Amino acid sequence: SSFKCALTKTGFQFYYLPAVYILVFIIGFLGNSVAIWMFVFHMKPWSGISVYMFNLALADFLYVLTLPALIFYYFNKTDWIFGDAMCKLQRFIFHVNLYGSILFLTCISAHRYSGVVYPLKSLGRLKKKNAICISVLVWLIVVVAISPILFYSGTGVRKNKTITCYDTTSDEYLRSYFIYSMCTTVAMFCVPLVLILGCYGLIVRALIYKMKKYTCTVCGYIYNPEDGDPDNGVNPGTDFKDIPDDWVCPLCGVGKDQFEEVEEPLRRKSIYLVIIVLTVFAVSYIPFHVMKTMNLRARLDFQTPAMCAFNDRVYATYQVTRGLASLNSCVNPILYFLAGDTFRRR
Ligand SMILES: CNc1nc(I)nc2c1ncn2[C@H]1C[C@H](OP(=O)(O)O)[C@]2(COP(=O)(O)O)C[C@H]12
Ligand SMILES: [Zn+2]
């Protein structure tokens, strides 16, 4: 007989995961409701960034709205009572949010990269129209790519007579599902992650190289390392700290001590982007994608009595990493502030 391992459902699933979802739900609702208000009604002129970020706030918000049912499902010992159609919807909206977020973060990273590494030369490519078209596509690519989940997922009856809402699919269709899940993880997670780390290295590199500008607090004259002050014997490409003390402002004659660092908004936002997005990937996206795959494998290839112990640890970890996937929806809001365009700047 086709031996099936015995599985173990912990208190994390029935009691403690739904509690976390309640917190995500509340904070997520607040964070993104406010964010959406700030974009739609206070940011225009939107740069391409605000276009992308608005799309994130939009997808996180709609996702959060699916939490109550998920919360109810775990409180109800994972017995799903809203039927097949709503199960498929729950899972569909989860993965659309998941992969939409990933791609939008890629666009945001790409956007910021071009603006940082090619400041004078990308202007046309970074305009808002392009951002809107890219955003439409991103939704098209995701909906198309994730649509099979409407087939694969859905409702099923357990031996104990309670109803399961598959997040993946039932045994009869697992093989093809595995192949499908491999494609999306490769195309809509692995590739992006590579593109993102690409951008990020280049961005950091350009930021560490770019010499700081300084400004005369007495007459406003900006010193640009790129131009230097050739007419007074400072060559193009000299750093302000390398200028001998005896130099003075060439416009009014005050000393170096009267100068101050020019605050470069784009450098700060780029670093806040890197830090936040790498954190999010390490806590929410990577562990989930590792564990989704291992857990499918376990279900297919590692189904023997020797493995079962290891297997329900995998299943157990999978549950936590699936819960950790939801944290982007109440962390992304800090992105919109710290890494997005500044309110007015005028
Ligand atoms: C180590 N992974 C699994 N091993 C065994 I045996 N059964 C598993 C494993 N992972 C999931 N299952 C069962 C059990 C699981 O149902 P349940 O809601 O956990 O009772 C299920 C798929 O759930 P999901 O991954 O689509 O969210 C029908 C499968
Ligand atoms: Zn001056």
UniProtKB/Swiss-Prot annotation:
Binding site for ADP: K9, Y166, D167, T168, N295, L296, R297, A298, R299, Y315, A316, T317, Y318, R322
Its biological purpose: Receptor for extracellular adenine nucleotides such as ADP. In platelets, binding to ADP leads to mobilization of intracellular calcium ions via activation of phospholipase C, a change in platelet shape, and ultimately platelet aggregation.
Topology feature Cytoplasmic, residues: 38-50, 111-129, 201-272
Organism of provenance: Homo sapiens
Protein name: P2Y purinoceptor 1
Topological domains, Extracellular: 73-88, 152-177, 297-315
Residues carrying sugar: N76, N160
Subcellular location: Cell membrane
Transmembrane spans: 15-37, 51-72, 89-110, 130-151, 178-200, 273-296, 316-337
Consequence the record notes for mutating T168A: Loss of ADP analog binding
Reported impact of Y73F: Loss of ADP analog binding
UniProt activity-regulation remark: ATP functions as antagonist and inhibits ADP-induced mobilization of Ca(2+). The P2Y1 receptor-specific antagonists A3P5PS, A3P5P and A2P5P inhibit downstream signaling mediated by mobilization of Ca(2+) from intracellular stores, and platelet shape changes in response to extracellular ADP.
Keywords for this protein: ATP-binding, Blood coagulation, Cell membrane, Disulfide bond, G-protein coupled receptor, Glycoprotein, Hemostasis, Membrane, Nucleotide-binding, Receptor, Transducer, Transmembrane, Transmembrane helix
Keyword Flavoprotein: no
Disulphide-bridged cysteine pairs: C5-C308, C87-C165
Family per record: Belongs to the G-protein coupled receptor 1 family.
Membrane topology classification: Multi-pass membrane protein
Residue window of the full protein shown: 38 to 334 of 373
Record's GO cellular component terms: apical plasma membrane; basolateral plasma membrane; cell body; cell surface; cilium; dendrite; glutamatergic synapse; plasma membrane
